[PDB]
Design a protein around this ligand. Structure first.
Ligand SMILES: [Zn+2]
Ligand SMILES: [Zn+2]
Ligand SMILES: [Zn+2]
Ligand SMILES: [Zn+2]
Lengths: 198, 197, 197, 198
DNA sequence: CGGACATGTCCG
DNA sequence: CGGACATGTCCG
DNA sequence: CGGACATGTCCG
DNA sequence: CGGACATGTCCG
């Protein structure tokens, strides 16, 4: 078992929030967000765009971490990792280690880290200020197993914790949302929102 | 070990316990007998205990659970998991493997071994009731059957729930009997049938 | 891999298979469909296959079981356990953990990986039927569901049972389809209902 | 897992057989044998007298081993040993290690052995010729857990294998019987014999 | 075992 | 925010 | 979940 | 070869 990171929202000196796109609940959707649930319902290995929203610009050098943990406290001390099967299916892009649940899509400066003590996985990319014509940076994350994967997540819910750091692994912003990698992100969102009444 | 009191003490905040009304189907996960004031539940399944209070108590208020043997011949013995279950590495990473009572769903859960009495207990910060709820629910697990050989060994037990401040002082006390067993509903029915002449 | 034949060959000894007639209750451990010639059984539960013979065959006669994929698109792929189950260390100490088919109850059980085809199979010495029995029973286990991801992956399979001498030569061949699944009875019923127009 | 010893009957140069006493099926019995089943139904830690029957006398020096194995082939490779609880209940007679299922009662020259490779337990006592007025030696064995012990035998059936050896651990005779340590050796015997018709 | 559904897949 | 099924799971 | 019972304990 | 119950388990 391994110790657990904070999930608490720390907006920080620079006003760190998160943005997700209007997506609907078409049983089929690649990726959809529940503002009510604070949870992404996305599909296996399909692009999950995350909006890095800010008040004011971080020091050049700043890195951006992602790390999944189990949500329930009875699994929080267990490392989130890929099922034996996907771990072995040769789906590496030549960057991401085959065991890592979270990948960053389309960026050469991506680092994948296995924590020295806790043994937890994460992926970091350098910060890069918003667009020419846009008020936030967007990262492209992929989830590499379904939440249901046998011998992996095993139908147990996770959080993604996105952290803003300087280049020493020191905190500057923190935010977090629930995640479900599933077949029909559309149908499951409705069913879980619809369950909120109770 | 010196036996902590169990004398129900509703207190300043009119604190009583509530439980789910879940019927007596054989293999119901958890079921409570009002007639017996006794929960019948399954090994390591979820056992909701409701906290009912009259007036919301102060901040930094804590909620404690401890088992004691109910018979007075066994009252001073520390209630513990059996040696089989203590060694089956079924810890969640948060509970000590010897502790019979667990709380799930709470990251602020704290486990205690008394330096004086050696008695296991488990505490969580008290929280005011949810959006429109009338009470706060706490989900406990019992990690050995009442029948565990070398553990409880068929001896009934009580769960003593204490409302306390940040300091350690009693604000409130309640208790109920527990049976942890394979068929909570079957057993509730038998023991209630056996009230009748 | 070169696909072994499955062409039923009753042989000199009038060897056919029999199976228990166990009904279609949802969670029946093992059940056989005559209409489908298909066993529906649960992961690692006991699956009696009866050997019926006309005239008792010679000594040192052996009995082999092997899985192949039934669809011809998948026929050459070696049937294997999935990566999860291969690594759950559920071996009995006698079976290799990658082998889907096991025999229980037999100390003379032998497991084989072909040096040519790489295909797993399992063999036991043939024994004449018991005290007044009409057949010899062999108890097999299937150690992955048909649905195992990275294993069978929802692809139906056949079990090829071969009667052979001490040497390796075919004396007898039969086969049936297997589904390993959580509800053998439910699934038998659905698939048979689906025969009808 | 550990390799499995032979159980096959080897009567040997000296005609090695076993004898058990007429005992009946009084639901209560300390110890009773089923000739039909070749199986002892006895109770936890109660005296199980085993008859060492012979044709002709073994070389002074000869030892007598007992070792339990599981009966079913799916457990035969697992070492038979005591449940965590009895293992810990301080019931040692100052000779038998707390982990050993089988003890020899009333004999000072008893050795308890943990096998060097397989890790299996056994207890050996020197051979001693029959009585002044008796045609066989009788050993007093005790079973130290019920077959049902949680984390021990776990309701799984065992064999006892009694071997005759010289003093180098070399074979001279072998015999074996099924065992059940239980609460009511009486009732269970009937029920298992009664099941033989089926 | 049912009921109810959790959750993947393919259908038209 | 598709529908219909394929196939595992949990609770009573 | 029932049915049926496996298997320990105490009863009169 | 006692009887009656206390309490876990497996199969359908
Ligand atoms: Zn996976
Ligand atoms: Zn226990
Ligand atoms: Zn599998
Ligand atoms: Zn024991």
């Amino acid at each position: 078992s391994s110790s657990v990171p904070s999930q608490k929202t720390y907006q920080g000196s620079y006003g760190f929030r998160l943005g997700f796109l209007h997506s609907g609940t078409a049983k089929s959707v690649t990726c959809t967000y529940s503002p009510a649930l604070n949870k992404m319902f996305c599909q296996l290995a399909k692009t999950c765009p995350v909006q890095l929203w800010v008040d004011s610009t971080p020091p050049p050098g700043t890195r951006v971490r992602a790390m999944a943990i189990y949500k329930q406290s009875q699994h929080m001390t267990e490392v989130v990792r890929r099922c034996p099967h996907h771990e072995r299916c040769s789906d590496s892009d030549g960057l991401a280690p085959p065991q890592h649940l979270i990948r960053v899509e389309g960026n050469l400066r991506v680092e994948y880290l296995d924590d020295r003590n806790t043994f937890r996985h994460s992926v970091v990319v350098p910060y890069e200020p918003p667009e020419v014509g846009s008020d936030c940076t967007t990262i492209h994350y992929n989830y590499m197993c379904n939440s249901s994967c046998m011998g992996g997540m095993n139908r147990r819910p996770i959080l993604t914790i996105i952290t803003l750091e300087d280049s020493s692994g020191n905190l500057l912003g923190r935010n977090s949302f629930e995640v479900r990698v599933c077949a029909c992100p559309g149908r499951d969102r409705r069913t879980e929102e619809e369950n909120l009444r109770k």
